[PDB]
């Protein structure tokens, strides 16, 4: 029944946003004569963005998810908004914010979005999230980024737990799985690779959330990394553990533990020469953000 595990990822890559929200959502609240509104839980959301008993629902005849207002619940319009935040890289937001900020006053408002919207013709659902429901709000690169991080943090924590950590730690294989799921890459090789982790790491104290988050923060800035290498005249250079740690530190301001690197090399080092070629890791992770 892996034909399904596969199937579900196709929906996750190749499918209307509606088809997806609907497929992973578990709540359906009806309030006659109103319409049915479908809802996700935070866990429904996270499963919807990451591979590997009841849709319940209630009916009337007649953590930044609490932020949504629906008491932790997530509506489709929430889905779109969150989905979009998560998938909009800092650099992109920064330009787009630029072009929107018409008077260049460091902010962005409804009137301006208003104007720009038109000039486009000559993304309408998100307006309340950006400028409140009053629409008299003002959006800031800093605000938004602050928020993007919280969202990524909370989502990644939910993901961590989805592995049932023990005293704050998951296994190396569980971690390798998170990486492989993240890579969005399907290969028998890496798959065989990811299984041998528990054997490669027969002891394994595991990875704490901090260790895992640190690495995903690095994954978050993997484009900058390639720029950093090129700058030092080393474009497409193979990574060794110490070099990976130096860049992660330089372009993401984090300290990657030796153990994290151990696992990441053990999983991605497909030719077994001890270092990660561009095609083996950066290429793939760079690709994971289009």
Among Ca ion, a second copy, none, residue 119 binds (CB under 5-8 Å by kind): a second copy
Q: Does 273 bind Ca ion (CB under 5 A)?
A: yes
Q: Is 91 in the site for a second copy (CB under 8 A)?
A: no
Task: Pick one of 31, 52, 63, 92: the residue that binds a second copy (CB under 8 A).
Answer: 92
Closest CA to 169 of 217, 203, 220, 219: 203
CA distance 197 to 265: 11
Task: Please list the residues that pair with 31 across neighbouring strands.
Answer: 60
Q: What single DSSP character describes residue 68?
A: G
Among 37-45, 101-109, 224-232, 245-253, the segment contacting Ca ion (CB under 5 A): 101-109
Residues in the chain after which the backbone breaks (C–N beyond 2.5 Å): 52, 62, 122
Facing residues of 29 across strands? 37
Dist CA 15 CA 79 (whole Å): 14
Residue 273 among known ligand-binding residues: yes
Measured CA distances, 174 to 150, 243, 261 (Å)? 23, 25, 15
Is 96 or 234 the residue whose CB approaches a second copy more closely?
A: 96
Three-state DSSP class for residue 215: helix
Scanning 18-26, 88-96, 155-163, 233-241 for contacts with a second copy by CB under 8 A, the matching segment is: 88-96
Which of the choices Ca ion, a second copy, none does residue 273 contact, using the CB cut-off of 5 to 8 A by kind?
Answer: Ca ion
What gap in Å lies between CA 20 and CA 24, rounded to an integer? 6
For Ca ion, the closer of residues 140 and 257 by Cβ is: 140
Q: Does 230 bind a second copy (CB under 8 A)?
A: no
**According to CB under 8 A, which one of 13, 56, 120, 242 is a site residue for a second copy?**
120
Chain centre to alpha carbon of residue 11: 17
Contact status: 186 vs a second copy (CB under 8 A)? no
Alpha carbon distance 177, 181 (integer Å): 6
User: Would the annotation count 269 as a binding residue?
Assistant: yes
Annotated binding-site residue? 164: no
One residue of 19, 91, 98, 136 binding a second copy per CB under 8 A: 98
Structure tokens at 67: 């932020």
- Number of shown-chain residues binding a second copy (CB under 8 A): 13
Shortest gap between Cβ of 285 and Ca ion (angstroms)? 15
- CA nearest neighbour of 208 among 249, 168, 246: 168
Positions that interact with a second copy (CB under 8 A): 92, 95-96, 98-100, 102, 104, 115-116, 119-120, 122
Positions that interact with Ca ion (CB under 5 A): 101, 103, 105, 107, 269, 271, 273
Residue set of the binding site for Ca(2+): 101, 103, 105, 107, 112, 269, 271, 273, 275, 280
């Amino acid at each position: 029944d892996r034909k399904v595990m596969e199937y579900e990822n196709r929906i996750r890559a190749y499918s209307t946003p509606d088809k997806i929200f609907r497929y992973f959502a578990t709540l359906k609240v009806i309030s006659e004569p109103g319409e049915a509104e479908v809802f996700m839980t935070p866990e429904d959301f996270v499963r919807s963005i990451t591979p590997n008993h009841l849709g319940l629902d209630q009916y009337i005849i007649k953590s930044i998810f609490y932020t949504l207002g629906e008491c932790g619940l997530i509506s489709f319009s929430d889905y779109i908004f969150l989905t979009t935040v998560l998938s909009t890289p800092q650099r992109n937001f920064e330009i787009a914010f630029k072009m929107f900020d018409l008077n260049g006053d460091g902010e962005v408002d409804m009137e301006e979005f208003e104007q720009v919207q038109s000039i486009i013709r000559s993304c309408s659902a998100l307006t309340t999230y950006f400028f409140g429901a009053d629409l008299k709000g003002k959006l800031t690169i800093k605000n938004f980024l602050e928020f993007q991080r919280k969202l990524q943090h909370d989502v990644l924590k939910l993901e961590f737990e989805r592995h049932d950590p023990v005293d704050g730690r998951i296994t190396e294989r569980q971690f390798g799985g998170m990486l492989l799921a993240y890579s969005g890459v399907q290969s028998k090789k890496l798959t065989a690779m990811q299984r041998q982790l528990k054997k490669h790491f027969k002891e394994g104290k595991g990875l704490t959330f901090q260790e895992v988050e640190n690495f995903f923060t690095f994954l978050k800035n993997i484009n900058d990394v390639d720029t950093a290498l090129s700058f030092y005249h080393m474009a497409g250079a193979s990574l060794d553990k110490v070099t990976m740690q130096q860049v992660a530190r330089t372009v993401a301001k984090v300290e990657l533990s030796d153990h994290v690197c151990d696992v990441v090399f053990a999983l991605f080092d497909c030719d077994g020469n001890g270092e990660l070629s561009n095609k083996e890791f950066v290429s793939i992770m760079k690709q994971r953000l289009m």
